[model samples]
Target: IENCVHHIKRRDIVLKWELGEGAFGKVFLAECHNLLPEQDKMLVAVKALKEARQDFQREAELLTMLQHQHIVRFFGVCTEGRPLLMVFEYMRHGDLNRFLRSHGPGGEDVAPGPLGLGQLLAVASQVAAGMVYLAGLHFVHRDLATRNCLVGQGLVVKIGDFGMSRDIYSTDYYRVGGRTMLPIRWMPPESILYRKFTTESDVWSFGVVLWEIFTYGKQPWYQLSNTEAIDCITQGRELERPRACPPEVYAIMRGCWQREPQQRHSIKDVHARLQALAQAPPVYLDVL
Candidate 1:
């Protein structure tokens, strides 16, 4: 990790407050000084790892290679010792799941303005666009879910949380074996049964993410246990569309949830469909 360093130093970042915590470590709202001109400072999300893990190193490498408007920007890292930290552009609105929960349906003391359909479509489209870029690079975002995506200012969405993500060098799928806890609710049949991850499996996860968006951050298959959810998917069960979901958008979700990996819609196709949906004229509901 030391070889990867270019300019930033460990002392350059001043941690302000903890934003959130995960299995590996905590993320903090930080102020990075001297990253630019002497007086120019940048606010960033600094992910401080409990220990130096290979996955963190890989995430840093992958983030450095990924450059897209809908992808989180990686600023730099501090791998000197314990409490290793990686810096990313600060997202004002936080993760999409948290944002939707606070601003959309089922929100606790939510303000009058609920998240509208147009904004949902825009978020979905941005995520799909980012996934398409990853697909072009032969990267499989094994962990594609609302929680892994960040919501920036103006509700802009970006793909993030590359800890479980991997780049495929030769084949489309990567096999895994370990105690790593997989998100069963967001996984496809093949991934559950074979432990094989591919872009197609990622497409399947994206479908669940769309469900999450439509349901305002509801947990996928809220009624089912992880084992039950896997069994349901394997037995041809799919999540019912949210009441507010448009038929066309639900159709896109269905396309992604196809049982056969090869039959699922590619990220590019999903992006095109979402772009078209977002461009269509707004639909108005009649008040009773």
Candidate 2:
């Protein structure tokens, strides 16, 4: 059966604020009509592209096929005008890295000082669960990191790729005398060496995502440059355990860092380990 894409109207949306601009285009916080009948108008993220790209519609079609609480929701798209708009669920807290930085240990001198340990675990588990769903379907996220996830109400985190992170977290990506940008920090050895992307590769990135949570959003291997990082990676070196991460959690990271793809734990197994850890005393699955 062919996937169905719900078409939206431009007139139905009232732009609120320009969220950010990236390789794709400008994303706006907007108010839309009838996305949810309970409310006459609801908040949404409307991604606007300068010129119509066929891939944009393909992305919309792909989004239409996805339905998971831990994955960012797709509302509809407005293709009737010059700048095409794709509507998505709005995450009030924005991207996960920024959220963690603002809420982690020292609070970054912002609201809600120091996120609870359980709360952090819930975030990691939710991400693992989402990846489990994605990988179960034989799909790859290509980019999986704290910066690519979004935080909504009650500390809910959803995985998504709006292309905004590349601009805001430019340092996380490196270009090799070309326009292409790869998230070197989160990529696995195979991905870095052969440009291979698979569920196994995604699992490797998830390990880095876990490290990001445990360290409260610090960039992976910030002490090393891309050249140095790749050199160490090729030599079978792996990231050190986060200062706050337990041995068990660090073990999960080690599993993902295995040089061989087949040797890496499957996303399902990874999620199970996360679920077990998340179920322990003083857990916050409720908040998630």
Candidate 3:
């Protein structure tokens, strides 16, 4: 983690298209000029706060030291600027959703789904491992999804926050209270319908996340209407078992979907189970 934080001049940073917005700012897909050795260009994630914010330096101190492999690596802060920049690693392969949809063993295409079942399980286990670390720090992701995680070489997946994940998928969210953007379809009834949200709900959310993994990037309940998606949780129904999912794997999803928060397994338990599965060979395998 040497030179973990870089102080780059404005002219040297190649600021590009908007990726996702932050609490009071935006996320940009920036290319750092020669920050990388080989191509003289490196893909970077720039999380910016409004002009000259006070907490950026403090924020950098916090996020930068969180060096777990499953978490997005925070490189440095754009030290001098109007809009403060928190530079982060930009995974080359992109978010897991796009990676799987474009490559997870299905469909008729020029380069169809080549990412195998082992990779999907690895993706699930990796994201949970990131959660294990963050959870120990008493942090909560609140929102977890395939789109929220980025992919890199060797099928490396790291968990990131809202900006990059929410940046590109504008339509996936619906506004609330004129200021809040909530992707309610992915939410559990305990939070969506009431004044309740917890790691338990996070557990529910990850269950939905694993479904995306099992189905190779498809969203939950697309066949249902928007209102119906939310209603299913209230009605005590979970997503049907994926075509390739074994009963054991499907059971994990079912456990996560339990209506009572206490009934669901903690992420630590979930992480352990995923690690066990990843250690052993999967029942099904996909090939090119």
Candidate 4:
């Protein structure tokens, strides 16, 4: 009965398959006529979760709770029985991962570099603003990575894909389920070893995100698997910031990656520091 109703609702709607299989199910782009006469908007991204579990509601709730310009807009949600669906703003430029991969220096297939410093700084500022909003609301985006950040039509950055986000004070933090391994290279050492994730751990991941932006979206452990990445990070393997990244930016990233979580810079500090850096003139290098 549930499946029948779901198909009925989606039957006439034409959906274009996009990239990235969702954590809970699938996501697609659906074309629809504008509701208002003045609006010419004709498309929307529909994220459908096969299992409408409690966790699904949690994600929806979190999205509803967050209100930030840099974060993706969650238009609404459908509770159409066994399977739930979410409607989000359509992104024309795909995600940072695919975007950088296609535009990597020396053409595709090469490691990313030669990023426009201004563009990188802009992305960092927006990401920090979005993260600051999230942190202020006591939410932690546990699985923050380049693949989750979307670049919209106007080159605006929107943080999306909240499958791994959860409340900082929630009891769910203690439960161990899903994959035992986490993204080690992007995570703090404490979280990598102890599974103790605090806002500090999230900050550590943010540093990796900064590295990704600076390098034009290269993975923190490019060409390395989860185990190898974890091992490297375990032995105090510091990520070498891109040659084009300014010294202050590199210093901030390294500060966040500090082995002692207590020493990691607060998100507020990060926001202030990056904003200050963004105001300065670009620093160029003679050789990359």
What TM-score fits each model?
Answer: 0.85, 0.92, 0.81, 0.79
| lDDT per model vs. reference | 0.78, 0.84, 0.75, 0.68
Better of 2 and 4 by TM-score: 2
Model 1 CA lDDT for position 288: 5
Residue-level lDDT of model 3, residues 1-288, one tens digit each, is 011456777776778888766556887898888675777888887877766455666667778767798998877777665677778888877788887787655332223345555666788899889878877776656677888888887678898763545556655565666866777666778888894767777788889888998888887787876676667767888789988676777888888888888999888988888777777754433221
lDDT agreement of model 2 with the native: 0.84
Error of 1 at 13 (Å): 1.1
Best by TM-score: 2
- Candidate 4 residue pairs in backbone clash: none
Question: lDDT score, residue 167, model 4?
Answer: 27
Off by over 4 Å in 2: 1-3, 106-112, 283-288
Q: In candidate 4, what are the lDDT values of residues 11-60, reduced to their tens digit?
A: 33357775446345677787644423575445777777766477766666
Off by over 4 Å in 4: 1-14, 18-23, 32-40, 106-113, 162-181, 223-225, 281-288
Candidate 3 stretches with Cα past 4 Å from truth are 1-43, 48-52, 55-58, 105-114, 162-164, 282-288
lDDT of 2 by residue, 71-147 (tens): 99998889898788888999988999998887766333233666665677788999998998888777788878998
All candidates in order of TM-score, best leading: 2, 1, 3, 4
